[PDB]
């Protein structure tokens, strides 16, 4: 059975794209092995439904990630942070897209991404919650607004809640992580007024002889 040593990465850090997990991009496993030595080194985040997400990725068996052309009209892309530096360079989750002010401007976004393939798409995205109100308006002109991610089966509304969070590597703020599955013939539709940590594409999601295990045993 094909073993993938998670080393210093957790399955979710490997998923999201934590800089020190770039080696895990698009990898497969019959068994993913999480080590107790693992850490995170990127923006502070919270995955409500963490355990569920970890489980469904583990039994899918791979992190095959396919990029997609989302049309983010009038908004600055590829934001980064001190909390997620690659070396001395500000970086971010390699599968997430931090949208923000472009020339002191932020328009509401309304984008769709139709699934016309023969398989299910897994979209991982999030929502940024600023520490202060100044932080809100600097990054997204507009005050706290909503994120609405809808399909023909699901519905996911998130309201950003501004407030001081626990200090993690330079930041007193946090990102909420959410996931969506889009069936063939279904369509991913994102309406966002701001605070959206956008998806860069999708994971091909399946199910099979695939799992995950926690262990510090030497793979030999």
């Amino acid at each position, epitope marked *: 059975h094909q073993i993938l040593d998670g080393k210093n990465c957790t399955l979710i850090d490997a998923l999201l794209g934590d800089p020190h997990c770039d*080696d895990f991009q698009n990898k497969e496993w019959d068994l993913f092995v999480e080590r107790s030595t693992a850490y995170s080194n990127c923006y502070p985040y919270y995955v409500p439904d963490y355990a569920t997400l970890r489980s469904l990725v583990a039994s899918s068996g791979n992190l095959e990630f*396919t990029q997609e052309s989302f049309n983010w009209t009038g908004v600055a892309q*590829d*934001g980064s942070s001190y909390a997620c530096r690659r070396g001395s*360079v500000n970086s971010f989750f390699s599968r997430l897209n931090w949208l923000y002010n472009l020339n002191y401007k932020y328009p509401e976004q309304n984008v769709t991404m139709p699934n016309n393939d023969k398989f299910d798409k897994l979209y991982i995205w999030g929502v940024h919650h600023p520490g202060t109100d100044k932080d809100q308006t600097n990054l997204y002109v507009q005050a706290s607004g909503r994120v609405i991610v809808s399909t023909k089966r699901s519905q996911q509304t998130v309201i950003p809640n501004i407030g001081s969070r626990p200090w993690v590597r330079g930041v007193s703020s946090i990102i909420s992580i959410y996931w969506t599955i889009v069936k063939p013939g279904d369509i991913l539709l994102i309406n966002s007024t701001g605070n959206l940590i956008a998806p860069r594409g999708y994971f091909k999601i399946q199910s099979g002889k695939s799992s995950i295990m926690r262990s510090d045993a030497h793979i030999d």
Partner: antibody
Amino acid sequence: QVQLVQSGAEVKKPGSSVRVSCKASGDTFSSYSITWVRQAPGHGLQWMGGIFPIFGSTNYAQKFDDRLTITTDDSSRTVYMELTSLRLEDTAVYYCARGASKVEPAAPAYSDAFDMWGQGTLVTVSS
Amino acid sequence: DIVMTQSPGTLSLSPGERATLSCRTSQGVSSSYLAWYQQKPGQAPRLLISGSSSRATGIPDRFSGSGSGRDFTLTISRLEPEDSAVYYCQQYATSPTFGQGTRVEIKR
């Protein structure tokens, strides 16, 4: 611009190891990515791992994983391809290549179009 | 694993004619992550097209790129004797994969 310059052709026996260099420009090395791609009969083109010398960060293909190492030398602007535990089907021409887009700190494109290419290095594996 | 299937295997046309090359992918590939290459016997691949229709620096305008989803195209408007080479498509939406190649012969 750079005109990537690789090592010369090699001959290795099965179970041995190569190191194939690539010499880049200051710009190519510190603000672009370097990729290895190999070619053979029946293997039209095979993307092997890639590197961002600027970060030292890597991504390898599983096919060559825990065998293929991609390292750099910042003082010479060179990227090295160390394929270990050589197999007869590793006989191929190994090219280095540059990522067409420039480095994006938030999302290092290890998967890209390949702008400039090295001359190719034939590694023959045989006893 | 995105499979790239090129059509035809071999194409033979005289100078001045238009060459049309086709590429079929196993997954829907965004047209902003697809490239075309030229490889003349013994050379390294030369980037012709990136972003499906964006022409690379130092490439002639007779080289045209098109396509979307799974159906992509390379058009060579006015063949020269210099265009005798193998052509390749590549997707870069996931870890880079390439086609089997199309061999273009120039008639004489």
